[PDB]
C-alpha cells in the first residue's frame, strides 16, 4: 500500500507482493506435451487420471455427490520412462498451469520466509486454477527422520505441514493439484491416510512388450 515518504500516510493502494514475485516458482503456462506424445506409459496414465484428473474435471459432480475431492497424489517409483514427461502431459490435458517448485529453495536457512513461500504458491495456484504444483525432490519437504535430528530438520517439517493444512482447508474444491516425485519413497509424517492430503500413492512399474513397442514407434 502506497505511503508518503515524509508525510507517512496512505494516499493509494498498490497491488499485492511479499518478497520477490515467483521467486521459488517456475511458470510454464500449459506444456506442449500430450498423451499422443507420451505413450506406452498407459497404465501409469490410468492411475494418474483416476486420482487427480477426474476430481478436477467433474468438480461439480463431486459437489452434488457430496463427497470431497482429493487434490493430491504422491508418486514414487522409477523415472527413466518419462515420469516428468507424463506429469507435463497431465498438465496439458487438464489445462493446468504447470509450476515447477523446487523443494531446496524453500528450505531457507532464514526465518519462516520459507513458510510464506508455501502460502504464496497456494495463492497463485488458486488464482491460476486448474494448476499442478510439481515438486522437484521430496528431500526437503521431507526426510525429517524420527530421531532427535528431526530438531535440525524443522524447516522441511514446516513447509510440508502448511501445504497439507492448506489443501485440506479447501479439499472439497479441486483447483490445485500437488504432485511430488522421487525415485523412491522416503520417511515422512503421516499423509497417505487422508483424502485432502496426498491421498493417492501411485507406483511406476516397468514396461512390457506392448509398452516398449509404442515407445519405439
Amino acid at each position: 500500500v502506497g505511503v508518503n515518504k515524509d508525510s507517512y500516510l496512505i494516499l493509494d493502494t498498490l497491488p499485492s507482493e511479499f518478497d520477490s514475485r515467483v521467486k521459488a516458482m517456475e511458470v510454464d503456462e500449459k506444456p506442449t506435451e500430450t498423451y499422443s506424445d507420451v505413450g506406452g506409459l498407459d497404465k501409469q496414465i490410468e492411475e494418474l487420471v483416476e486420482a487427480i484428473v477426474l476430481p478436477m474435471k467433474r468438480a461439480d459432480k463431486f459437489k452434488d455427490m457430496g463427497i470431497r475431492a482429493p487434490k493430491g497424489a504422491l508418486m514414487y517409483g522409477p523415472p527413466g520412462t518419462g515420469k516428468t514427461l507424463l506429469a507435463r502431459a497431465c498438465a496439458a490435458q487438464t489445462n493446468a498451469t504447470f509450476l515447477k517448485l523446487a523443494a531446496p529453495q524453500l528450505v531457507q536457512m532464514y526465518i519462516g520466509e520459507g513458510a510464506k513461500l508455501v502460502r504464496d504458491a497456494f495463492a497463485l495456484a488458486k488464482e491460476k486454477a486448474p494448476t499442478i504444483i510439481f515438486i522437484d525432490e521430496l528431500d526437503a519437504i521431507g526426510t525429517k527422520r524420527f530421531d532427535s535430528e528431526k530438531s535440525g530438520d524443522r524447516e522441511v517439517q514446516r513447509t510440508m505441514l502448511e501445504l497439507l493444512n492448506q489443501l485440506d482447508g479447501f479439499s472439497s474444491d479441486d483447483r490445485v493439484k500437488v504432485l511430488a516425485a522421487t525415485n523412491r519413497v522416503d520417511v515422512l509424517d503421516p499423509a497417505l491416510l487422508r483424502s485432502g492430503r496426498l491421498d493417492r500413492k501411485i507406483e511406476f512399474p516397468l514396461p512390457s512388450e506392448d509398452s516398449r513397442a509404442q515407445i519405439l514407434q
Binding site: 507482493e17 518478497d19 520477490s20 514475485r21 515467483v22 521467486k23
Partner: protein, 61 residues
C-alpha cells in the same frame, strides 16, 4: 554484465511507460516493461540487467 538482482537505486529518467526497477527486500520500485533503446536505460545505482524475479532490465548493456 553479471547480476543476481537489479538495483537502480533512484531512476529519474527512463501499465507503464517509464522504468523504475529496484529489486531488494527493504524497498521496491516495480515496472513491468523493459526494452528502452533510448535512453538505453541502465545507469543509476548499478547492478542492472535481468532479475531473479523477472521484472528485468531487458537489453541495456
Amino acid at each position: 554484465h553479471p547480476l543476481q538482482v537489479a538495483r537502480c537505486t533512484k531512476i529519474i529518467k527512463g501499465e507503464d511507460a517509464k522504468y523504475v526497477i529496484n529489486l531488494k527486500q527493504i524497498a521496491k520500485f516495480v515496472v513491468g516493461l523493459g526494452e528502452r533503446v533510448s535512453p538505453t536505460d541502465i545507469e543509476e545505482g548499478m547492478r542492472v540487467g535481468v532479475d531473479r524475479s523477472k521484472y528485468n532490465i531487458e537489453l541495456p548493456l
